Amino acid sequence: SVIKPEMKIKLRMEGAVNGHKFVIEGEGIGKPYEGTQTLDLTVEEGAPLPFSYDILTPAFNRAFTKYPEDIPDYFKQAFPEGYSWERSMTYEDQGICIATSDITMEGDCFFYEIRFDGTNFPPNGPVMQKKTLKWKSPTGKMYVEDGVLKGDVEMALLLEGGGHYRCDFKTTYKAKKDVRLPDAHEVDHRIEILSHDKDYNKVRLYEHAEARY
Numbered sequence: 592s593v594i595k596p597e598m599k600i601k602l603r604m605e606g607a608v609n610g611h612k613f614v615i616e617g618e619g620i621g622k623p624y625e626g627t628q629t630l631d632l633t634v635e636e637g638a639p640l641p642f643s644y645d646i647l648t649p650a651f652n653r654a655f656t657k658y659p660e661d662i663p664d665y666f667k668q669a670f671p672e673g674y675s676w677e678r679s680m681t682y683e684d685q686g687i688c689i690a691t692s693d694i695t696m697e698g699d700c701f702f703y704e705i706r707f708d709g710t711n712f713p714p715n716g717p718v719m720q721k722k723t724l725k726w727k728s729p730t731g732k733m734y735v736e737d738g739v740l741k742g743d744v745e746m747a748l749l750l751e752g753g754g755h756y757r758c759d760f761k762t763t764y765k766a767k768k769d770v771r772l773p774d775a776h777e778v779d780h781r782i783e784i785l786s787h788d789k790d791y792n793k794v795r796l797y798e799h800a801e802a803r804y
Contacts, residue, residue, distance in 0.1 A: 594623050594654065594667045599700035600630060602651065606707035608688070609719065613637030617651060619796075623667065626657035626801045629785070632794040639790035642712070645723040645748055648782055648796055649760070650678070650690045650707050653742070656778060657801040663773040664802075665740050669766035671696040676764045683757040686712035717756050723748040726782050731760070733802070734775040740764040742778065778802045 600619040606612070614636035621628025630651055634640060658664040666674065673695040680688040688709035695702045712718045731744025741763050748756040779801045786795040 593671050593696075595699060596622055596624065597699070598623055598654070600628065600652070600703070601700060602630075602703035602705055604647070604650065604703075604705035604707050606647075606705075606709075608642050608646070608707075608709035609712050610710075611637055611641050613640060615647070615651075621655045621798075623654050624657065626655055627799050628652075628655040628797070630796045632796055634792045638792050640792075641719065642709075643718045643721050643723045643748075644784070644787070644791040644794060645726065646680075646688060646709065646718055647707060648726070648784065649680075650692065650705055651796055652692075652694055652701060652703065653764075653778070653800065654694075654701065655798065655800060659803065662776050662802055662804075663771040665764065665766065665770060665773060668770035669768070672767040674764055674766045676762050678760060678762040680709075681759045682712075682718070684713050684716055686710070686716070686718060717748065717750050722751045723756065724751060725749055725784070726780075727755070728779070728781050730777050730779050732775070733773065733778055735772045738772070740772065744780070746780075774804070776802055776804055 602617040604615045617630045617632045619630030654666040675693045678690045691706040693704045727747045729744045729746040733742045743761040781799040785797045
């Protein structure tokens with residue numbers, strides 16, 4: 592109801608990481624009740640990007656999560672009025688990103704307005720040397736405190752050579768209106784770049800997500 596088996600996506604991200612400003616625009620489509628979605632992403636400003644694209648992709652909507660009927664679905668309940676989120680991302684090698692997304696809805700399409708800022712990434716390091724391969728597939732924790740939904744997860748970039756590169760994610764969400772809050776619960780997270788052009792100016796990005804206890 593109002594969330595259809597198919598929901599289009601438009602987004603705009605403005606940002607800076609270690610000072611290089613950039614804009615990225617995206618258009619995709621997904622199946623909210625199956626928890627899957629595909630986005631096509633273009634770097635409109637600041638190409639060629641001088642850092643790992645992988646630090647961005649989790650910022651590119653938990654309405655695309657398969658929720659059992661036994662767990663209230665905060666994100667689908669928030670529509671058509673929407674919700675926002677604020678996220679901190681603290682990497683092990685003392686680099687840090689902060690991201691915001693305001694998610695609205697108009698018809699068959701979700702719209703995101705995303706702000707992404709990162710700083711103090713090591714020069715030799717895996718992000719500004721583009722040595723990340725993919726995120727691992729965590730299952731993170733959702734929980735409520737004092738009326739706000741919180742969601743956070745330890746995860747990690749695989750590196751060229753076999754190593755791993757760790758990041759603590761902490762997100763706080765907000766619906767525009769009051770909705771039923773859930774139990775503490777979980778959310779998987781399979782995120783992979785399916786395709787990209789040479790400098791990740793064009794990227795096809797795909798996610799599968801599902802909740803449980």
